[PDB]
């Protein structure tokens, strides 16, 4: 069973910091491009930041660019989203997703409504 | 034009008969120990000579007879009963300095195109074995390639058989039968048929280059057409239109001007009826070349110069656009030191063209290299 | 027996005529995929060249399995509504269509929809484009860019910036196999011109002329 | 074309040579 | 909400898949091996028949 | 609320303990002493050509000489494989055909795809003019697989996370099997056709039954989408082949994976799984364009088919094990023997 167990999400004032982590079991973590998908209170699912298999291909939305910094550690099967200088437009449920196929540059259906390999999400509130 | 060998043998035979009818006309030879009438198979002497220097001084059947009309050779018989003799000779003496004329370039041109046609024909039977023996390459583009390669192989075969027939037309055994009078190879219709096959295989090569260019132009500029109707049209243009202007050349060279075999071109209009359709294939391939290269330089603008040069040097052998630089030279008007270099940049180019379209469109072709990679890979798992 | 094999072979022959006649119709038409009851074919024919576009409606929002049916279309039409950020939501879908293994030879015709909406957005003071893309705040409109009239340099800024995002995804990989054609939403003439351009580049690639 | 020319030139270079060789055959024989 | 009712139907479906018996994997594995050795003669892809009674020649 | 998800987590944890409690050996551990299987040389006997686009599904008749094949050009060709003669060529209304089926009686042929409708065609209608017997609509996504149970029943998996048992004579869903959270990509009917397994894009398979309609079993273990599923010929096991490039043998009573057919050099997912008549060869089509033939017990690949120029979309072994047809995206069906 592909299990994405997000953790580390709490409450903080604007300008604070949180460190999310999704503990990922059931699959070989190194073969997959991971992702961070936040879901706002009033809207759908926004992709935030992906990181490829190695950990050197990193992209972001510009809404988090310069402010958040993901990293994966392949040995501990972990994926982090260091959060910094949070805004009230950044309060959301942060699902840590996982594109389905291994070794693929494409990353489909991650922000879909009923995507399978997405976790349950830490509610990050500011 | 210039004289023939068969014309010279016919002129010699009629001269021989005509001067034998005057050799036994009236013998005067009432002198003592002097030369009599004879025919030395070269020039007939007077019926009686009592010691005077009177010869016919040149025979008129020979090729360069109109160049030298002058005579009066001082070659007469002495009072020893026969003609005067040379240094250790038993032949009657006669001077031959008054009737005499004044190559390796053809051998050099022949070596280049023979090497080129052999290398091309080898590369093209390998390319045909490849394009027929993979079954994933079996698209209509490769069928137009295969008929192009078969036209090239027919061109190389016809060029070999043509040179063999030229070796058999003027061999010493063939010349020996021809100046004995009758029954040479030059009379036989197999000579005419190999010199008709050479023109058809050349014209089919030029029209399959034209079909390659027309097919590429309809792929790019025109819409999708029905593959079987366009292929039945392409085989009819590539193999049937060469018949449509070779059969007029065959019948005209047969009935109007049949000097020798159909190998030398005396009347240049009768060779124009085989040149102008070939010039038409050349011209349409040059139009298709410049239009496809405009399509490539418009596609490359969306270094540029080094990819465009590779695409141009790839397209030049497929359409035969290396003929365009010397097609308008028109060898009626090329005579001199141009007629060599023209032949060079014709013959060699066309010969190695069969090499160049086999390297570029079979061997370094990416789909064929892909098929070789997959064939060796599915042999490696065995 | 031999007679029933003869009947079966004459049925094979009369089926091969229909497959020969259907190959002519199938190779003539261009299959598109409009990717702005489960499929909506819309046949249209401009300059006698037959297109039939496929608007995949009544499907789920999870496209990683039925998008492989459309690997042999001539083009994916990608209508993106230039305004949840639903511009990055199309940036990421183009990023996954471009780098998909099967759509790696399939070219994309990219329609950047709703430029008048973007104009009345950017002149009114509703510039979310700088908030969601701070790389636009240091952007400069290129010299090879046409400000066709009714355009001040605040809408031709964001417009060419948004196609620069997609041509930044598009020119990372996929150099010769497939091409992204960006346009700003006559609309069918652009699809036809770019399908002619796709087909021409496919044919030029089959000869190694490109 | 090239082989019409070449062969024309070849054939008549050889036919003229055969004419001169025939004339050389008549001088002795 | 309705998502909690859907989770309740899910956990009831998971309750249905809990009262079933799971045999030892050695017994099921030996059943599969018994099937592969029992039908070992009538499978022409593994053990090819002679080309007489082969329709693909 | 959230603690209901915790109770479901403890229930699936109880399932995990109850499944590793019945696991002390493997299928590999018992099979160290069995005979190996040689390099399976299969040459392509027939090459059925005649499809214009990529063949997305083929299916054998139960007499194992007629095979229907659907391609994405919009064509459903019934072939005599013994003579390479086309028996029928049904033109379809929608060209996007993701599946085909042949009725086990041999009278009907299903097709379906992105049009969300299963079209059922009568082959033996009056004298032979293949018209549509029944268009079964009621699915909300694309049809991925369809498998006739009888002449009168079919079951269709769809990409609306749902399988459905229909009735061909009436035209309406007899049963609706819900429970998947991803697009059901395949289904496989048992030899008894009472149960059927259905793997989906959520990496899970589910064993159903057409009588009741509730989910009998659920099989996790794969990492990505299950592109293919097929039953072992006794109905007790089934092999799932997914897009994480593994096959896995799940047994029903063991309720978990018995073997995992992977390789290090293999990176792309299994498009099609099929078994032999014995179940000794698990043939598996691939996106590296070749069908590997896995020894099902020993889990070492016996042979490779390797003739196809493109992705081997479909792969089907006969009823009597006599041949194996692989269609592919190069539009050629190859019969291997
Ligand atoms: C005309 O000049 C001479 C008549 C000619 N005779 C000869 O053969 C001249 C001698 C030169 C032979 C040239 C070599 C032939 C090609 C050698 C290499 C061929 C290799 C093929 C490469 C694949 C005649 O008319 O026959």
Residue numbers in the entry:
A (entry chain N): 1 to 126
B (entry chain R): 28 to 129, 138 to 337, 344 to 423
C (entry chain A): 12 to 47, 205 to 251, 263 to 364, 370 to 394
D (entry chain P): 1 to 29
E (entry chain G): 6 to 62
F (entry chain B): 4 to 340
Please quote the authors directly.
Glucose-dependent insulinotropic polypeptide (also known as gastric inhibitory peptide, GIP), glucagon-like peptide-1 (GLP-1) and glucagon (GCG) are peptide hormones responsible for glucose homeostasis. To elucidate the molecular mechanisms by which tirzepatide, a GIPR/GLP-1R dual agonist, and peptide 20, a GIPR/GLP-1R/GCGR triagonist, manifest their multiplexed pharmacological actions over monoagonists such as semaglutide, we determine cryo-electron microscopy structures of tirzepatide-bound GIPR and GLP-1R as well as peptide 20-bound GIPR, GLP-1R and GCGR.
Peptide 20 contains two modifications: A2P with Aib and K10P that is covalently attached by a 16-carbon acyl chain (palmitoyl; 16:0) via a gamma carboxylate (γE spacer). The structures of tirzepatide- and peptide 20-bound GLP-1R are highly similar to that bound by GLP-127, with Cα RMSD of 0.8 Å and 0.7 Å, respectively. The substitution (Y10P in tirzepatide) and modification (lipidated K10P in peptide 20) stabilized the binding of dual and triple agonists by newly-formed interactions with residues surrounding the TM1-TM2 cleft, a phenomenon unseen in the case of GLP-127. Alternatively, another three residues (D21P-F22P-W25P) compacted well with the ordered ECL1 of GLP-1R via a hydrogen bond with Q210ECL1 and packing with W214ECL1.
